[PDB]
Design a protein around this ligand. Structure first.
Ligand SMILES: CCCCCCCCCCCCCCCCCCOC[C@@H](O)COP(=O)(O)OCC[N+](C)(C)C
Ligand SMILES: CCCCCCCCCCCCCCCCCCOC[C@@H](O)COP(=O)(O)OCC[N+](C)(C)C
Ligand SMILES: NC(=O)n1c(O)c(C(=O)c2cccs2)c2cc(Cl)ccc21
Ligand SMILES: NC(=O)n1c(O)c(C(=O)c2cccs2)c2cc(Cl)ccc21
Ligand SMILES: [Cl-]
Ligand SMILES: [Cl-]
Lengths: 702, 702
């Protein structure tokens, strides 16, 4: 293995001169506007087919290989949807039939507009809690039992419609890339804090206590206080039933995971528990005997369309944005796992449109907002679901319950529903281990997990999320705030330059400094960069320039007085031991000491690093060349270029050659727009590599 | 010029093996605690001298060269401080003597604790507006015309004390670097919007109209409606006087800038206008004759110390955080200008401590918050100010007015003070030109400017700033969100690799792809990076792996059937035209096709890119080596590392050798903590440069 190279030393300009470029186009935004104005029938076709995905997947359905799978998966998911709809309607604090509406409408809409083939569309616990909190606030801000339920049901429907409107708007504006602004640490911390929120929310049903409609901030603490202050009023029958169901479901749930091979089909413990709980409750007349809360009678059939309330929209708009983003983020994440697994394209923009339309329709018909539940989606997929036909079948199961078999669920205890929801919390609850994992791998990510968790707990799920996204953006600045700048040296007398402090027997060419900032330089960075560069070269170039300008002034003074006489050969100290009086420039004249030194007046050059006439003294510097390794400087901003231009001008005015190496062509293209180059800062300072600049410097000094 | 290199090809591990590394001394956090816990006698001296800068600069005072200069600067600044205090107390909507308190107390405290030598400490218009808005809100949120003034004075004093407490806390915690989080575009947009706010705030005094205490959001609009709704009630005498003063001052101000060379000393148009205005008002009895609003009778003396109100603290903590941050940012910017001009160190933490103590004392003695006015600081410096003795003499002038000669300012109209404040707006209002300039230079900074302006106009100064800082952090993600990734090729047949689309006669070694991402890869980035890499290589490695696994499965099945035999020379097709039978794997078995292929059962090796038996087909790829140019990848985060590892694992599983080049040693050190390396992803994939990896690949293929 030999790395052997023989080429010219290349400055970036010299390289462009010797190597012809290719034609480039600006791709004017007007051109983008031009392309948008296509109207080609094929484009129209693709667009409509993009907006109505069912017209493409339905016709290509493999009936023989997919129908039975979707039918079986649909029945399974349909049952889960019914029970989860009831439970999550409890979480919204409205009658449980509206959870059935929330499990029905969004899914039917998704069948026509969704691009995912595996998610089960409907409510999930975090969004139901967020909707319930939005409702409590809306009601509290409304200028003046069943009546209270009516108001909550109306506020929930309005919140749902506004969330769907926001989602649909974001999908029409093609901003489905917003999910990228959420890191995995943020999602982990947020979902752990949200699992704690859900746990606390189920306590009023486990104990059967009456808890006020608390709002954020610190609603979780407010609820905990409400639950524990009145803990003696707890219904024992509710608690025991909840404990038994929770204990049994968890034991059986683990068995399914451990013994997947041994089992022909997983035991459906959650379904078995509800049927048994409902049967026993009905059989032993638990509602009368132990005064247990039960699901109760639900009137069959759907509600008539409700008009969204504009007053509610004004009151809850901030909440709705949080609800819309959370709904989209969760759905997209769940969908992504499946699309990747099954190798099909998932369109983020279409998902926003589909989820948004589903929500608007659901809200109008009195259901609450939901996108997808990870547990329900897993069931649809694990039971063999192939397409969104499984989702349609599931919706039909929900419809049957809503229209004909709703009465069967009447004797089911609320605590049992709450206990099932608690069982699903374990996956999310196990995310506490991530803090330790993150701590070893990356402190910034660990900080993000912790801040997100704290923000989600103290402020609510919605406000906490906004604060968490802001803090996670701030950590990007934390990462690049104090870059580990370095001085580089040559290793092995070849073209390799590394940290001057890392290896033995390194070599700096005499009078050359090579400085590296391993980060992009911008507003939060450039002062630190200047401090580190001045520490690396060992002096401040502006201080040196000011001391030289002062000396030049004294020299000119003595020259005019006569004590000093100019000469082709240096200077004449006509008068020895001369006077010692400083000019003491005023506040309005001191700026002259910062101007480029011009000594043309004097015929000869003043070597500023050699002795000066008449004891005049100025710090001497050995630096004649400064190389800035800009390979890791990704971008620059106006502050960095202003600061940069400033630093470079100062080095150049003190006769030190400056070289910027390791940048690409886009970089110099960008730097040309900033009006960076002029006289006394030229594009000649850019070289290809550190070794190009070093060899150029050595030839100059030769 | 000739770049001539002859060295070995170096993998990062090989280079380290061949070049001994120096002592890697880790820095223990406990050790930091140890160094922080030194308590040496000299260290104590340095700390106390740091907290009491006066004990350091006073003894070194050059009486002969500074005394007179500081005296003249002090008298000049003291006069400006009196008038600016009265005007800015108008902006706080309290009696104007509290502006005199605000000009007195913080300057006296800063004399002892400040590190700057040129700023004039006291109120400025933006902070007075912010304090006035905080008071209005506090008053409203309080639970149940002198009394109104009394309530407003108490709330202003409490807001001042809490702002000072926050500043002092930030200074003790050594967080004076927070100033870096404000870009120049943000500051420009914010100060232009704040100048518009100040302009609108002066209209009730120019016209002499009664305006309610409007709060934010959109307070600027609320006030404008109130002003022009009553425009008919305008006092003309006030207006005319204001216009004349504003006109004369503006014209003469211009002359001072234009005729500095011809002028021995700047004309004091603001003082002359104030003296003439007050004289005519008294002489012609303007208060009675034209019913004009005058400054009125101020009672001489200071107020007794007042106790901060905790209720006001609770109601204003957020406004007080905003006030503290704005005060420190303004003071530090002005002080940094002057400390760079005169080359002396400026301690930001000490600055935070001094301003906090000054604000605490001012608020206790019924003044309001203030850090420094650029207009007054410039006067102190321009008039010859050398040390903070000029600030002491200015505070003595303010004291003389408060105690003895305040009655002289009784007949001065408020419209004149408002007109004087308007004169100072010109510098900030001309910043509107920045939009066009920044548009040409950098559209992200133009966006920061415009959004800061809009946030500060719509929301207020405090909330606008918070929203603007958040948006400016979001623009950093906007910059690095969709990196312009590229494929590189060789130019010149030497170690230079550039964008494959930029030059003619470039060369890619056959089967090698070189991909560059010119940005750090983090969470908002890695999905885009994967998409671009898959577009660059021309296939998805996971799709190729899944198809090969399917082929292998069919093969093994046919081999089981016997229809296929195995030879070191290939596969025997005893039976041809096989019955195609896709296994149609179900949802729970499909993940097997994503696993590393282990065809060790077979004696030979299946050239996956040659033709397979019985028409078994798999997409063929020409890629055998992928080089990732990571020179501009500053940092990685957990999401990016996970995404990176997944990508690499997939490429390795389809037998594509992967190389990462151009990183430094800190990078690999960091990557070792993420548990990135294991079997099948080794540190052998890191090479020094692109040419090292290319030459290694070529030797492997030889
Ligand atoms: C016939 C009677 C109807 C029964 C149908 C009910 C539906 C029964 O299906 C449940 C199975 O899908 C098992 O679910 P999983 O394997 O996804 O369990 C994972 C649990 N976590 C951890 C994801 C929460
Ligand atoms: C003795 C009699 C009274 C003396 C009072 C002297 C009052 C002080 O005189 C002010 C002069 O210094 C002029 O100030 P500048 O040159 O800084 O003007 C700049 C204006 N802007 C653009 C910054 C607003
Ligand atoms: N398989 C699986 O994971 N399941 C769940 O997670 C369920 C639930 O979470 C809830 C029901 C009510 C509130 S939560 C669930 C229900 C049924 Cl009927 C069948 C499977 C189920
Ligand atoms: N030189 C300069 O810039 N000056 C200003 O900007 C002044 C003011 O802004 C105000 C006075 C009252 C309300 S504002 C000012 C005042 C005086 Cl007496 C002398 C110079 C001044
Ligand atoms: Cl779930
Ligand atoms: Cl000012």
């Amino acid at each position: 293995n030999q790395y052997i190279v023989a080429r010219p030393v290349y400055s970036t300009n010299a390289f462009e001169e010797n190597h012809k470029k290719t034609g480039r186009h600006h791709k004017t935004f007007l051109d983008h506007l031009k392309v948008c104005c296509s109207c080609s029938p094929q484009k129209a076709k693709r667009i409509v087919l993009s907006l109505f995905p069912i017209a493409s997947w339905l016709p290509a359905y493999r009936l023989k290989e997919w129908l039975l799978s979707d039918i079986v998966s649909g029945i399974s998911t349909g049952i889960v949807a019914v029970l989860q709809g009831l439970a999550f309607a409890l979480l919204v604090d409205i009658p449980p039939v509206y959870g059935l509406y929330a499990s029905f409408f969004p899914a039917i809409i998704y069948l026509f507009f969704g691009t995912s083939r595996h998610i089960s569309v409907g409510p999930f616990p975090i969004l139901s809690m967020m909707v319930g909190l939005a409702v409590s606030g809306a009601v509290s801000k409304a200028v003046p039992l069943l009546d209270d339920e009516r108001v909550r049901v109306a506020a929930a429907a309005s919140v749902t419609v506004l969330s769907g409107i926001i989602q649909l708007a974001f999908g029409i504006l093609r901003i489905g890339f917003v999910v990228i602004y959420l890191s995995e640490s943020l999602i982990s911390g947020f979902t752990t804090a949200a699992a704690v929120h859900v746990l606390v929310s189920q306590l009023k049903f486990i104990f059967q206590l009456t808890v006020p409609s608390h709002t954020d901030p610190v609603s979780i603490f407010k609820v905990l206080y409400s639950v524990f202050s009145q803990i003696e009023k707890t219904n024992i029958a509710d608690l025991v039933t909840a404990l038994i169901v929770l204990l049994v479901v968890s034991i059986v749930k683990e068995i399914n995971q451990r013994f997947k091979d041994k089992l022909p089909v997983p035991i459906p413990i959650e379904f078995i528990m509800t049927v048994i709980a409902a049967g026993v409750s009905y059989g032993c007349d638990f509602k009368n005997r132990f005064k247990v809360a039960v699901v109760g009678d639900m009137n069959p059939g759907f509600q008539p369309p409700i008009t969204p309330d504009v007053e509610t929209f004004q009151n809850t708009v901030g909440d709705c944005f949080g609800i819309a983003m959370v709904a989209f983020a969760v759905a997209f994440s769940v969908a992504s796992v499946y699309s990747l697994k099954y190798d099909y394209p998932l369109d983020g923009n279409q998902e926003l449109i589909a989820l948004g339309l589903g929500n608007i329709v659901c809200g109008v018909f009195r259901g609450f907002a939901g996108s997808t539940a990870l547990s329900r989606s897993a069931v649809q997929e694990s039971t063999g679901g192939k397409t969104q036909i499984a989702g349609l079948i599931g919706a039909i199961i929900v419809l049957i319950v809503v229209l004909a078999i709703g009465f069967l669920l009447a004797p089911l205890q609320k605590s049992v529903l709450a206990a099932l929801a608690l069982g699903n919390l374990k996956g999310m609850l196990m995310q506490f281990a991530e803090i330790g994992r993150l701590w070893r791998k990356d402190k910034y990510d660990c900080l993000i997990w912790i801040m997100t968790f704290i923000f989600t707990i103290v402020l609510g799920l919605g406000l906490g999320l906004a604060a968490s996204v802001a803090f996670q953006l701030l950590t990007i600045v934390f990462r690049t705030q104090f870059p580990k700048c370095s001085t580089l040296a040559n290793i092995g007398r070849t073209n390799i330059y590394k940290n001057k402090k890392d290896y033995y027997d390194m070599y700096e060419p005499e009078g050359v400094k090579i400085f590296r900032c391993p980060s992009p330089i911008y507003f939060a960075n450039i002062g630190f960069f200047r401090r580190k560069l001045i520490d690396a070269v060992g002096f401040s170039p502006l201080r040196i320039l000011r001391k030289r300008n002062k000396a030049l002034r004294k020299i000119r003074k003595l020259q005019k007085q006569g004590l000093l006489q100019v000469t082709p050969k240096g200077f004449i100290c006509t008068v020895d031991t001369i006077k010692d009086s400083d000019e003491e420039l005023d506040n309005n004249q001191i700026e002259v000491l910062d101007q480029p030194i011009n000594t043309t007046d004097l015929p000869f050059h003043i070597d500023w690093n050699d002795d000066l006439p008449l004891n005049i003294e100025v710090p001497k510097i050995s630096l004649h060349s400064l190389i800035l390794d800009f390979s890791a400087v990704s971008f620059l901003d106006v502050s960095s270029v202003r600061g940069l231009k400033s630093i470079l001008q100062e080095f150049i005015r003190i006769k030190v050659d400056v070289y910027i190496v390791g940048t690409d062509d886009d970089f110099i293209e960008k730097l040309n727009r900033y009006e960076f180059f002029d006289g006394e800062v030229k594009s000649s300072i850019f070289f290809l590599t550190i070794h190009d600049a070093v060899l150029h410097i050595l030839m100059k000094k030769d």
